[PDB]
Structure formats: structure tokens, C-alpha cells
Design a protein around this ligand. Structure first.
Ligand SMILES: Nc1nc2c(ncn2[C@@H]2O[C@H](COP(=O)(O)OP(=O)(O)OP(=O)(O)O)[C@@H](O)[C@H]2O)c(=O)[nH]1
Ligand SMILES: CN[C@@H]1CCc2c(ccc(O)c2O)[C@H]1O
Lengths: 247, 294, 54, 337
């Protein structure tokens, strides 16, 4: 009852998220947000269904190339979604903080979305293609057809490029917008903004920040966290794709 | 024929190229509409932008001014000018020169100018008068509405005599504009014109506001007052009119409707400097509120 | 002034006109509509072959 | 003095008594015998795009293939309804336009607005360069409508309670009409181009004479402003759409109001009315973003066209009665069939 019941929840969650994301997907911001819907749809169509089957005690052992592709798609999917939020924040800062030139800076001529997607795919599929990863326990795992690991600070580059860099911009960008609103309200006179900023940023932080802490920790030192807890953290982190609060 | 349809497609392509180019310009322009009562100074403000941002008529006004004063009856009759209508630009011509003369205008009166890499479009409404103003539904997309009133005319009557004084006509018109179905999401910039004439009237003891406005007797000056330097008698009268306009806006005002009061004199070039107009036009909080409630 | 005098003269001309029964007008309208209802493309739909827009 | 006003009031009593004796029976009683038309459903065959701002006017061509539209950004685009291909895009001297027209011969286009000036353009010319021909400028107050009797005469209805019959060759007013106490908002020429009507702002519509130049009749059955008017295809009746939800049908011969069209769930206004080819359907625009189809003889709604996203401000029906075009304020035109 317990093992089967958990699979029912995860299978429903994967299917439930797919319905919401597809329905949504106008202005430049709508075109920017369309990338989030595309990434969520791709995730729900490809990665989410395999997750329950893999988490089940029996492993499918479908293949080696298919497993490599499935592992590689995770970086491309996660990096694409997180990077777009920084672009949205930058666009909002341009629109709000600088009143004229909003129209002389933003143009229809897509290009930034393609560049971001290419950058996200650069760090995902290339390590899978070259197939050179990394110990005795690390070895002999791929001989029999799933362990995850990283060496030569691959996780450090993956975390900084995909997660650490966006959050450096996020604090600086969103600090100016809130500061301007506080002084602007005083002018009219002589809570809502705070709630909006909290709703916007708390989900992102509480969903992604704890995961990469363990991601960096497990490789830096000896074994201090189990595989199951790391998998559970990843599963909790995947909720943000369906959680993404916009319109 | 095949060539007949080919030519039509080529003609369609040429027009489509120009429409895309012209779509950029229309978006990057700001449009402002003037409003107010008669003999207020809407045209003078427009002429200011031409001078800064980018002979028989003069004598004609002087010709009419001399006859008007004599008909009522010379210097003594000029002092008691409240009873009979007379042109404001009388003493200046009898004794900025091109801006003092008044010329009647029927057709729309437009103006194009650029201040800082941004195009602005200011046009006058025009016309002798209306009680219907059915064209008001056309101006449903302007960014702001500029309102100009005569702050030194509270003891003179409308051109149709035996009517309400000029100030009360402005208050009634402001209420109609504010409570309009079509103009429900347009902000208002308020210009209290003719400040120099108000100072001269208050200094002399010929007339008092308390006679025409009974409520002025018990009025106390606001604590948060900033007399720019400044007699207390002049400052108190100056602020009372400004606060009287505000109580109309705050009553029926909502989240989208705002109001910007200002003090200005139209003839002076410095007081009409579009720098504060530019700041007020860019201080609009539509950008913030909109993305998300913020 | 004389605006009423000019106006009151106009109503005299409008008053002296000939009016017919409402029944005749209704019958004429009904007869015209019944006669010309045949060639009304909007009323009775036309086949798509004969439709220039489809 | 009061005696002159007393005679004016006395005469108004005679008119009402005369109209009462001529009402033998209502139109509803006679029309009850006929069968209802039934539900009418039509779909947008084509959609015309390219305008930037709201459309305020639209007029079909003589051949019922080309139509001209006017917008608030200063553009006058001529379309091709068959294949959706623009032919011209004439810039305008001002951005405020409230009317447009199209010549019976197809060689001229008219325009006007808040500039108090009616312009005339030339389409068929040497080197294919459209240029302004004449600029009639004798008015005060905005214009509302323009019509062509031929290539040499144009009728306009300005906003100063007057109407005039112009002349392109000389640019002078041949005659002028007076008698309204409010702004004139619309007009419609007779099929024989001998008489025309005009819906003023004082809830009164008249029947002028082009040649003689004096008013003939006056109908004042409404209760609010008047925004549209259109002649019956027969030429002996017209339908009026007012500011309130009611739309009424008048008759020239009897001189009285025949029937009224209204519904309990509609409290919006009417901006444009028109008939069908045989005078059986009375289409009408509305302020609730869609269009409704009435019945001339039965006075019941028989279809709703709700493919728009903003208010409908113009409407027209082709000469052969094969299509219906409705503009709106969302910069989109449509064709229904
Ligand atoms: N002393 C003084 N006179 C002013 C000032 N502003 C306007 N005037 C006078 O008022 C005139 C302007 O009036 P108009 O241009 O007719 O203003 P308006 O009545 O709004 O314009 P219309 O409604 O289009 O007729 C100037 O020529 C001056 O005579 C001001 O600040 N000081
Ligand atoms: C097993 N799930 C993977 C593993 C680690 C990882 C993910 C996403 C982005 C990265 O940069 C990563 O390093 C996760 O989706």
C-alpha cells in the first residue's frame, strides 16, 4: 500500500503538471514566458514519466545510450528554465527603473531566447557525448546496465553557471525595484509590493537553494549524505517547473 | 493572367514595408491634450514650447481696448474693471510682447516638438463653447490631460452676464471632466495660471475673497506649506484655491485616477520650462502598478 | 425677436400635407418584401459554388 | 410676443390630432400572419488587417469589390475584398478623421474630421500619384458625414446645426439648410438622389429637399440622441438608431412611427444601422462589442455576430447583398457572409 501509493502520487503529479503548462502555451514578455511553458512541457513529456519507474526498486535497464541521454536532458531542462527568470527580472528592471528608452531598447528581433537555450544545451549534452566521467566504486557501475557523480569540479561549473550566476543578478535587480516603489508611495502620501516580491522569490529560493548546497557538499568531502536523500531533494526541486505564479 | 496577380502581390508588398516603418514612430510618441475655460491661457502655453523647445493684430487689440473703457463711462474707470468685461492685455499695450496679444482660434491647433530624444504631441481642443462635447470620446488614448484655470479671476462674470463668476465655472467644468465615462483612466495635470495678477489683487484692498467665498473666513493655512521666497496673506489665498480643486478629485478618485497640482505663470519662460512637465510626465506610476500589483 | 415669427410660418406649410392610411403603407411594404425576397443572397444562403467569397 | 408663441403651441396640437385620425391599424397586427425567418448564422469569410488605431468610417464601392477605411492615425487604405490586397495608403494632413466616402464612378475619395475641412482625393491620374484636388473649408465645428451625388457635387453635415451642398469645381456652397437646434450626426441619400434625411442631436429627424432647399417633415418620437440613419430600399421609409437601446422605423407617407425594436437585456447604444437587399433584415451595431440582426416585420432578434473585441463603429452592406462588413476600435475589419 505504501510503495504503490507513493507511485500513484508521483504519477498523478507528473500528469497534473503537464495539463497546466500546455494550456498557457501577447507581448515581448509573453514571448519570454513561452520558454518556461515549453521547458515545463518538455520536462513532463520526457523526464517526469521515467522518474517514477527509476525510483521504483526494479530498474528498467532499458539501455546505456538511452540512460545517458535521459541523464543529460536534466541539465538542459533545468538550466533553460532557471536562466530565463534572470532575463525576465532584467527586462522588468529595464521597464520599471528606466522610463524612456524602454521602447528604444526592446525589439521583436527570439535572439536572446535562442542564445540562452544554446548556452544551456552547451553544458548538458557535451559531457554526455564525450562520455569521460571521473574511484573503484565509481568504476564498474557503468559496466553493468543509476549512479550519479562528478569529478574535476564539473558539478562546481554546472552549479555556478546554472544557479549561482542567476541569483547574483536576482538580488541586485530586485533590490532597486523595491527601493524605488517605497519612495514613490511616500510621494503620494506627502505591503503589497513586499508580498509580491516574497511570493516571487520565496518559491525559487526554497526550491533550488537547498539542493545545490548538497550538490556541492557531497563532492567536496567524504560521504556525508545518502543517495536517497539527494534523489528526494532533486524530486522536490523538480516541483518548481509546475509551480511556475505568472499570470 | 499570371502576371496580373503577380503585380498585385508586388504592390501589396511595397505598402506593407511602409506600414511597418510607420508603426515604430506612432508608438514612441507622447500625446497631451489641453483643456480649460475661456480666457484661461491654453494657447499661451503651447506658444511657449515653440519659443523654447523648438503687426496689425497687435494694434487691433489696442484699438478695441480703448473703446471698451470709454463706452462704460478714464483711469478711474479702469480701476473698477470687474463690473464690465475687458481684455486682460490692455495695460501692457496701452503704456513677451508677441505673446501678450490674444487671437481667437476655431480649428484644432497642433504642435510637434522634441525635448530629449523623445517626441511629444501637444494639441489644443479649440472652439467657442459646448455643453455636449461629443468629440470627447475620441481622446481615449492620450497619456495625460492638462487643465488650465484662471486663478486671478474670482470677481468677474462669464461673457453671458448675470451668471456665476469665472472661478465657479471652472469648478463645474472640472467635475464633469473628472466624472466622465470615457475619461476614466486618464490622469490630470493641473496648472493654476495667472499667479502674478493674483498677487497684485491681494495686495490691494479693493476686493476681498471673503465676500465672494464665505468659507474663506474660517480657513486656516495648512501646516505642511512651503511658501517659496511671501506675505502670509498672499500665501493663504494662493493655497485655498488649490485645496478647493483637490477635494473634488479625492472624493470620487480611485486607484487609477491621480491629480498633479502646480503653480505657474504662463508669460514667463522660466515658469513654463517643460523640465518639470517632463518629470511629471515620466513620474506616472502606470508602469509599476501594472506588471503586478506592486 | 422674429425667430418665432419665422418658425411659426414653417409649421403652417408642414401642417397642410396629405396623409394616407397606415394599412396602405403596411400593405405596400409587405408586398414589396414578398416580391423581392427571392433574390436575397443573405436571407436564403447561396451554394458555395456560386459564392464569390468561398 | 406671447401671441406668436401661442400660435406656435396651438399649431403643434393640430399636428398630433391629424396623426391620430390616420392610424387605422398597427403594423404588428398585419405582419402577424407571416412565418418567421428563423435562426441566421454566418461566419467571417475574410479578415482585413493593417490598421494601427480605431476605425471610424467605412464605405463600399460601386462594384462591391473595393472598400475604403479611415482611422485615427491618419491613413486611408483601399482594400480588395476578394484577395485581401491593399491598393493604396494615402497619408492625411491631420490625424483626426470621422468620415469617409467613395465615388460612384470610383475616381474620387472624400474625407473630413475635426479640421472643419472636407478633402477630395484623385485616384485615377497621370503617373499614378494621388494628390489633393480641392479642400472645401467653409464650416464651423466638426463634420460627421459625406456623400456624393455625382463626380461634381458633395453633401456634408457639419456640427454647427447646418448642412450644405458643395460644388467641387467652384468650391462654394450652392445652398445651405437650417432648422436643427443640435449637432447633426448622420445622413443618407435617397435611391434617386433627390431627398435626404439627417439625424440631429435633439431627438428629431427631418426630410430635406436638395433642389428647393427647405424642410418638408419632422419626426420627433425618440427620447435621446440619434447616431445613425438609413433609407429603406423602396425609398419611402427609413430606420433610425438612437442613443438608447430603442431603434424605430418611420414612414414618409403616413408621417408616423411604425414599429420599435428593443430588448430587456440590452442597455447599450447604437452606432450604425443598415438594411438588406430586399429590406427584410435590419442589422444594427451596438456598444457591447457585437452586432445583432433584427427583423423588419416581426421585431425579434434572429442572430448575433460576436467575433469582435471592441465596440462596433461602422457597418455596410454591398450593392448585390452578398457580404456585410463591420469595423471596430480594435484596428480590425471583418467580412461576414
Ligand atoms: N499677465 C498675464 N496674462 C496672462 C497669463 N497667461 C495668459 N495671459 C493672458 O491671457 C491671454 C491668453 O488667452 P488665450 O490664449 O485666449 O487663452 P484661452 O482662452 O484658453 O484660448 P482659447 O480658448 O483657444 O480662446 C494672453 O495673451 C494674456 O493676455 C499670465 O500668466 N499672465
Ligand atoms: C539527477 N538529476 C540531475 C543531476 C544534477 C544536476 C541537475 C540539473 C542541473 C545541473 O547543473 C546538475 O548538476 C539534476 O537535474
Amino acid at each position: 500500500v505504501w510503495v504503490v501509493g507513493m507511485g500513484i502520487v508521483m504519477s498523478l503529479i507528473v500528469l497534473a503538471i503537464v495539463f497546466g503548462n500546455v494550456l498557457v502555451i501577447q507581448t515581448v514578455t509573453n514571448y519570454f514566458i513561452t520558454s518556461l511553458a515549453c521547458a515545463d512541457l518538455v520536462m513532463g513529456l520526457a523526464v517526469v514519466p521515467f522518474g517514477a519507474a527509476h525510483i521504483l526498486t526494479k530498474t528498467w535497464t532499458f539501455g546505456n545510450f538511452w540512460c545517458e541521454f535521459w541523464t543529460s536532458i536534466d541539465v538542459l531542462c533545468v538550466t533553460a528554465s532557471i536562466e530565463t527568470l534572470c532575463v525576465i527580472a532584467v527586462d522588468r528592471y529595464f521597464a520599471i527603473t528606466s522610463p524612456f528608452k524602454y521602447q528604444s531598447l526592446l525589439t521583436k528581433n527570439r535572439v536572446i531566447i535562442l542564445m540562452v537555450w544554446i548556452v544551456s544545451g552547451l553544458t548538458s549534452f557535451l559531457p554526455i557525448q564525450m562520455h569521460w566521467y571521473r574511484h573503484q566504486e565509481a568504476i564498474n557501475c557503468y559496466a553493468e546496465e543509476c549512479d550519479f557523480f562528478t569529478n574535476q569540479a564539473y558539478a562546481i561549473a554546472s552549479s555556478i553557471v546554472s544557479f549561482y550566476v542567476p541569483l547574483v543578478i536576482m538580488v541586485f535587480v530586485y533590490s532597486r525595484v523595491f527601493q524605488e516603489a517605497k519612495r514613490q508611495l511616500q510621494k503620494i502620501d506627502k505591503h503589497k509590493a513586499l508580498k509580491t516580491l516574497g511570493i516571487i522569490m520565496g518559491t525559487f529560493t526554497l526550491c533550488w537553494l537547498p539542493f545545490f548546497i548538497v550538490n556541492i557538499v557531497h563532492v567536496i568531502q567524504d560521504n556525508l549524505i545518502r543517495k536517497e536523500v539527494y534523489i528526494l531533494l532533486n524530486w522536490i526541486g523538480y516541483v518548481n517547473s509546475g509551480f511556475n505564479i505568472y499570470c | 493572367q499570371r502576371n496580373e496577380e503577380k503585380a498585385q502581390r508586388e504592390a501589396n508588398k511595397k505598402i506593407e514595408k511602409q506600414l511597418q516603418k510607420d508603426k515604430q514612430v506612432y508608438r514612441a510618441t507622447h500625446r497631451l491634450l489641453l483643456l480649460g475655460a475661456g480666457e484661461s491661457g491654453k494657447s499661451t502655453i503651447v506658444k511657449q514650447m515653440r519659443i523654447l523647445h523648438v503687426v496689425q493684430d497687435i494694434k487691433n487689440n489696442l484699438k478695441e481696448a480703448i473703446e471698451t473703457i470709454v463706452a462704460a463711462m478714464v483711469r478711474a474707470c479702469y480701476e473698477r474693471s470687474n463690473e464690465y468685461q475687458l481684455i486682460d492685455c490692455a495695460q501692457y499695450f496701452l503704456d513677451q510682447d508677441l505673446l501678450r496679444c490674444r487671437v481667437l482660434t476655431s480649428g484644432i491647433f497642433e504642435t510637434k516638438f522634441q525635448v530629449d530624444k523623445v517626441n511629444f504631441h501637444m494639441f489644443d481642443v479649440g472652439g467657442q463653447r459646448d455643453e455636449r462635447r461629443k468629440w470627447i470620446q475620441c481622446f481615449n488614448d492620450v497619456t495625460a490631460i492638462i487643465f488650465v484655470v484662471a486663478s486671478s479671476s474670482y470677481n468677474m462674470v462669464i461673457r453671458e452676464d448675470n451668471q456665476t463668476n469665472r472661478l465657479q465655472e471652472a469648478l463645474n467644468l472640472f467635475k464633469s471632466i473628472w466624472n466622465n465615462r470615457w475619461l476614466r483612466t486618464i490622469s490630470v495635470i493641473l496648472f493654476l495660471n495667472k499667479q502674478d495678477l493674483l498677487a497684485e489683487k491681494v495686495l490691494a484692498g479693493k476686493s476681498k475673497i471673503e465676500d465672494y467665498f464665505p468659507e474663506f473666513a474660517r480657513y486656516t493655512t495648512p501646516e505642511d506649506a512651503t511658501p517659496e521666497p511671501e506675505d502670509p496673506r498672499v500665501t493663504r489665498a494662493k493655497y485655498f484655491i488649490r485645496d478647493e480643486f483637490l477635494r473634488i478629485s479625492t472624493a470620487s478618485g480611485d486607484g487609477r485616477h491621480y491629480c498633479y497640482p502646480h503653480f505657474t505663470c504662463a508669460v514667463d519662460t522660466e515658469n513654463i520650462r517643460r523640465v518639470f512637465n517632463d518629470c511629471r510626465d515620466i513620474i506616472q506610476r502606470m508602469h509599476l502598478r501594472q506588471y503586478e500589483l506592486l | 425677436i422674429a425667430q418665432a415669427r419665422k418658425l411659426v410660418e414653417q409649421l403652417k406649410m408642414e401642417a397642410n400635407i396629405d396623409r394616407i392610411k397606415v394599412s396602405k403603407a403596411a400593405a405596400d411594404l409587405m408586398a414589396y418584401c414578398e416580391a423581392h425576397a427571392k433574390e436575397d443572397p443573405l436571407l436564403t444562403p447561396v451554394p458555395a459554388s456560386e459564392n464569390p467569397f468561398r | 410676443l406671447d401671441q406668436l408663441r401661442q400660435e406656435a403651441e396651438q399649431l403643434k396640437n393640430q399636428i398630433r390630432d391629424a396623426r391620430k385620425a390616420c392610424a387605422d391599424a398597427t403594423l404588428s397586427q398585419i405582419t402577424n400572419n407571416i412565418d418567421p425567418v428563423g435562426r441566421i448564422q454566418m461566419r467571417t469569410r475574410r479578415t482585413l488587417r493593417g490598421h494601427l488605431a480605431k476605425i471610424y468610417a467605412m464605405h463600399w464601392g460601386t462594384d462591391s469589390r473595393l472598400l475604403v477605411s479611415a482611422s485615427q492615425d491618419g491613413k486611408l487604405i483601399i482594400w480588395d475584398s476578394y484577395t485581401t490586397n491593399k491598393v493604396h495608403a494615402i497619408p492625411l494632413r491631420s490625424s483626426w478623421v470621422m468620415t469617409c466616402a467613395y465615388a460612384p464612378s470610383g475616381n474620387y475619395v472624400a474625407c473630413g474630421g475635426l479640421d472643419n475641412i472636407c478633402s477630395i482625393y484623385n485616384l485615377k491620374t497621370r503617373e499614378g500619384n494621388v494628390r489633393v484636388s480641392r479642400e472645401l473649408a467653409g464650416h464651423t465645428g466638426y463634420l460627421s458625414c459625406c456623400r456624393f451625388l455625382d463626380d461634381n457635387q458633395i453633401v456634408t453635415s457639419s456640427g454647427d446645426t447646418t448642412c450644405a451642398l458643395w460644388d467641387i469645381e467652384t468650391g462654394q456652397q450652392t445652398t445651405t439648410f437650417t432648422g436643427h437646434t443640435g449637432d447633426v450626426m448622420s445622413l443618407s441619400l435617397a435611391p434617386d438622389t433627390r431627398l435626404f434625411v439627417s439625424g440631429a442631436c435633439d431627438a428629431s429627424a427631418k426630410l430635406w429637399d436638395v433642389r428647393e432647399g427647405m424642410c418638408r417633415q419632422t419626426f420627433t418620437g425618440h427620447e435621446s440622441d440619434i447616431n445613425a440613419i438609413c433609407f429603406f430600399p423602396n425609398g419611402n421609409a427609413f430606420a433610425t438608431g438612437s442613443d438608447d437601446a430603442t431603434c424605430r422605423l418611420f414612414d414618409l407617407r403616413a408621417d408616423q412611427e411604425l414599429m420599435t425594436y428593443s430588448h430587456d437585456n440590452i442597455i447599450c447604444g447604437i452606432t450604425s444601422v443598415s438594411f438588406s437587399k430586399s429590406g427584410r433584415l435590419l442589422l444594427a451595431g451596438y456598444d457591447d462589442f457585437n452586432c445583432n440582426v433584427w427583423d423588419a416585420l416581426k421585431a425579434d432578434r434572429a442572430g448575433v455576430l460576436a467575433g469582435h473585441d471592441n465596440r462596433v463603429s461602422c457597418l455596410g452592406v454591398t450593392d448585390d447583398g452578398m457580404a456585410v462588413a463591420t469595423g471596430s476600435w480594435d484596428s480590425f475589419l471583418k467580412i461576414w457572409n
